[PDB]
Amino acid sequence: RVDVSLPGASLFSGGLHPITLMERELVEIFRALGYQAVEGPEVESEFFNFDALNIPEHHPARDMWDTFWLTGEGFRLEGPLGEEVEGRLLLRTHTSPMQVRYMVAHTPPFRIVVPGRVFRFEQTDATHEAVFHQLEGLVVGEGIAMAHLKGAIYELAQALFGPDSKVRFQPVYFPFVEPGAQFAVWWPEGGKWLELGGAGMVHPKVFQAVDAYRERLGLPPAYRGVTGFAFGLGVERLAMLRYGIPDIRYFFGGRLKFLEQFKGVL
Amino acid sequence: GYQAVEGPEVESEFFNFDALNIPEHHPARDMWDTFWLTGEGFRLEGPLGEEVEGRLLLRTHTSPMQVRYMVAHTPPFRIVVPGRVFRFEQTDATHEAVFHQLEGLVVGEGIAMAHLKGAIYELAQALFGPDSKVRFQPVYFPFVEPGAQFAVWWPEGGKWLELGGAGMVHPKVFQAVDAYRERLGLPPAYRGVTGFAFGLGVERLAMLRYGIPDIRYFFGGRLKFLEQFKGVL
Amino acid sequence: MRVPFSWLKAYVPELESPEVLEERLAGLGFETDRIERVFPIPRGVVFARVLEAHPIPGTRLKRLVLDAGRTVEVVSGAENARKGIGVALALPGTELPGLGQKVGERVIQGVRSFGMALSPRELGVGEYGGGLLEFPEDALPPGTPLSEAWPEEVVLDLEVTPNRPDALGLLGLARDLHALGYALVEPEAALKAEALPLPFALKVEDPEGAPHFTLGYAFGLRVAPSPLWMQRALFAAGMRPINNVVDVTNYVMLERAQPMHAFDLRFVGEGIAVRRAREGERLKTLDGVERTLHPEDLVIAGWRGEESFPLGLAGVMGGAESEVREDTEAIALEVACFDPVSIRKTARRHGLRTEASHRFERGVDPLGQVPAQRRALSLLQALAGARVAEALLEAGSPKPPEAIPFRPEYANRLLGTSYPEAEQIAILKRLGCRVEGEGPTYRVTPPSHRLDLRLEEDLVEEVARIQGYETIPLALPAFFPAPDNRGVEAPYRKEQRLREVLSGLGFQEVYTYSFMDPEDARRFRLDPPRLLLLNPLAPEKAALRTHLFPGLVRVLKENLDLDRPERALLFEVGRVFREREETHLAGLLFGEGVGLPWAKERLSGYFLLKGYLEALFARLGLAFRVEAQAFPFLHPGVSGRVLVEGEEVGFLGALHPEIAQELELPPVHLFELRLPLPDKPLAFQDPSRHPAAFRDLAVVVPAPTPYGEVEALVREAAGPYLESLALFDLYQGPPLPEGHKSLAFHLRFRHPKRTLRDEEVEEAVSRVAEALRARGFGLRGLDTP
Amino acid sequence: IPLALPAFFPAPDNRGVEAPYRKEQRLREVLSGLGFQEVYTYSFMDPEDARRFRLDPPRLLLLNPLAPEKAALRTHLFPGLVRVLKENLDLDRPERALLFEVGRVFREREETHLAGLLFGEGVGLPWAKERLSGYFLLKGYLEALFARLGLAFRVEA
């Protein structure tokens, strides 16, 4: 007899990592809203990570990010236009520096979303990591207002949690935005207010840093008569609440018994 | 901002023609060479799963989906409906009885033709680069008014490519939609809105873009042919 | 329709050139498919006067004595050749567009033919070559190069959409150009009518068919050739001139989208009656075709006493008899508006497509008949010396068009423009609309010739096209989509990913026609197709495919004949029809298999395909398995149905050998499922850290028993701590109870928290060993060193 | 503050700027489907492994590492993969595994890398004996990947 219910050739079946899944969904959501995804480098200079974003040194505000400083010659970090740049190297503490790199290399109006791995010197536990992911958002152009930032997050919530979903905005501080704000979303199933990220209207000094670097590079100013909003949200926190994952350390853990569990969600 | 939804290949005369202001014995109904069908036992469901009646046929375009969607949802929205369509024609080098179209439908308060032109403009830019441009010329369609055909400028070929037709959803389409709605228990949802629609042929575009000479290959089945697109994924 | 530049220029004198005209018309909504320069006429062709025509004895040719400046002789075999007409004389030495070999002096049947008289075909102005061009005898001074009165012309092939039937007349086109700003020159139908009764009556017996019908009366007719200018005009439009009366009816038709027909009174009798045709009634149309009429055919008839007879097929084509000729002295001019549907059906029924039917099918100005009569009669008076009665016979009274509400504010809102009100209103007037009121909502009543103007929207398009579609700005809309539009793209996305996973996994996508050969229902052994085509492209494509695999097997075949694929892993997603339209996914496997090409071993057939599918589902995260079940089109030995998440959705197996035979093909493996596939939620299973238990043991079972039962039996009994469970070996042979087999099973147990003690396992494993026997199986795998 | 959405034609040089990101994403998806299982490993590396795995020493170091084991920036991707294969063989006993990881590597310049790992009995009938494994199995898969990407492939000595 030709047993048809017998195991067939053991061809391998692949899968995508949960962060890749979460990031993808997040990118899909924003693509539908007109956002384009671009990435930045993990090793940045203090200039892009801090100074260009209105976060000076010995600044009590620079303590909001526990930085990993680097050392070593021979490494050539290129700027927005491929040009080699200088400054104390570090691991970006957020994706925000990409806001600056992009703006000097392009012209408004535009919509970008920049995903990426970030690093912060912290003790890795159940809900904390030294290595995680963020997703930046940047929309610049004439007449761009905070009403648009609120509109963006509102669409994010709807797409993420359904029609019974809602967002709340509260003032908060960031050197690169003003007005500044933190936003939370209403997750119906969990019946809880989830804090997703921060945002605001691009700070006046950011545009100045951008155009200053531009002239210093030969390009003409492109940000004097425009405004914009930016936002940044943590990927793991969201991936966890969405795939029901208890420990954030698994993401980098490597357990196949763990990763394999997302072959379904592709 | 457009979302993709599909429709059925076997449609009723009502959705394919009547709901789209294309009555029978209409000199305008000749713009589509229809494949009529026969046979009982087949149960065609409407927008809300309800069984519907009428002479069956193979949709001659995707447009009937505009109607199905509108009765099942509420404005404002943006949809794009791809799909296989059929027309009784002689299959040659640049003609097929079985091809594909992509519909576009955007409805809502204050939606104007300036938006239709904006849509096509973005389509051209995305498709052919910044040196690309679109041109609109009046043309006739029973389901739109103003009506229009649009062409795009393809820099490499230095030629004006005719891509499809479009226009502002015809007043009678909205009426057919809301009439079918009430006849179904739903409340009217299209009395104070306007919208634009467009439809473009897929093969013609695929050909110009992948440098394919004969439109018959698509359905041909030659692996030596299909295999050539493993690169473009 | 063909649009002769200089003819159109007679109504629109300011036209820049054929090229600027093509641009103007494109923006008005009329695309030209071709621009053609047409009447090149050499110096050698001159106008000649036929002084006399002498038949050459013993032949069917004539010796023409021509006045072409000096007298010359020419031989002609054309039956229309005769004294008293003007002709196109190609003098010896002339190079004509056709023959390529110069015209010269030649001896024919005893006479020196000094050149030759031309037919429309020889001169290159028309396709007709059955006779000579016929001109007015005094059209020009004898010997005058013909080109001097017949310049080359440029003709545009215009596409005229169904909504613009008024554009089926040159004057119609002229109106649109006038709206753009060009001065319009309308012909003035100057009549010198006479008050007297028409020597005939009118009886419209069918008012539905002929909602408006008029008859004009012209007498004292002097039937002769049309002026050169009219022949040039008619020829450029694709029509052949006949004589002044007939030509005038064709010229006016082309001028104002109004077919009309001169009926020779000799055959009319006491009157004309527009009536349905009596079945069996015969009628020889002017195309020489002898026809028989249907009772649904509207007819133009005459009557004499108790006799009633067909004179013409109404709105389609006139009869051969009453058709106007040289001895015609008086006529009844028919200018009417017929029922589109009626003409539509008749035209189809008799396989006729004429300039008349075309226009009546598309529609004619419901109130244009009287003005049309004036034009035609006026021309008849000027070109045929006609006397015309001031009265017309008229039946029907169409009501003028109603007013349409129009709001400049809405026009700009709908278009997204900002045209000042004054320009909008003026545009509408240029097109001939009446505009009343003060605003914001006006009362605009369109001209009767514009059948396409009924709604406010139609009116906004008038403003848009005249201002120019290019003046409409570009913009993008911004809005929060209504709630129920949320995630409506899920279905479409779901299937697309399935294609991509498949595409990457190894399957090659194929697209096959939705049509199927009714015969294959028999061949591939399937239930007959439910939907059929009442008008298929061919009997081979007369039904709607019921399955997807048949098409795949077919392409495998034709692929093996054009190229010789040593193997192939295909797949296709498509709409299948049966009781209800549904989406299907089908795959096909064939060939040597997979492995080292230079080596020998191979992974092929059923299990290879089953492997891939297992992968696909592992990747989709759905439960998969194939149980035994036979299918007419499969192999009773290699056949089973597919279960996704414990739900039947299709089949899997080897094609039937017999089936492979009629189609001459090697063993083919395949499957077919129904989409969309089931969806399994993620119930994330946190993996325990504590080590797991490792245990083996085989199972003895009869050759029949499906791997299924065993696996399920073993599994369900393994307990709530069974982690893994895989098959690693099959024996069936010596020294086993003949007719039995052994199944090598790797097992693993684990616990969420605490670790597992040898007691819990050695004890739970028992709960499976004895339930394995309660069914009738043992545990060959025991005591392993 | 009201809610609203902005509407505008993006400046020309913002056109197709998402190409790069999309390109890599498809590569992951093709890989994911082809059979490779994605893994995410820390960008940090043990300076010691430069010796162990026999590689040129890492160019960038951390003036404030989390621990000496994570004091440098990974120079390769495969080392991390071999490590996870190990710790995977200790917690659970995978009889095989086909992994892959895309990540940023550092050396003279930051660059993106794609690494894969094969191990185990192989592919074939579980109850049977023959197997498709080792080098050529992995080389097969890669040949597939590239046939699918439509790019010329080959491995020289």
Ligand SMILES: COc1ccc(C[C@H](N)C(=O)N[C@H]2[C@@H](O)[C@H](n3cnc4c(N(C)C)ncnc43)O[C@@H]2CO)cc1
């Ligand atoms: C019945 O109702 C009608 C018929 C025709 C028309 C169209 C057009 N006004 C017109 O010229 N009407 C008619 C006819 O006047 C003309 N014609 C063209 N050729 C001939 C001909 N021979 C070639 C022998 N003999 C008699 N008439 C001829 O062709 C047109 C096509 O029928 C309108 C109403």
Ligand SMILES: N[C@@H](Cc1ccccc1)C(=O)O
């Ligand atoms: N970079 C910020 C997030 C943020 C991005 C952009 C604007 C405002 C806040 C953080 O690390 O929290």
Ligand SMILES: N[C@@H](Cc1ccccc1)C(=O)O
């Ligand atoms: N359905 C039309 C295309 C179209 C769609 C929508 C609006 C206008 C035109 C066709 O078959 O040509």
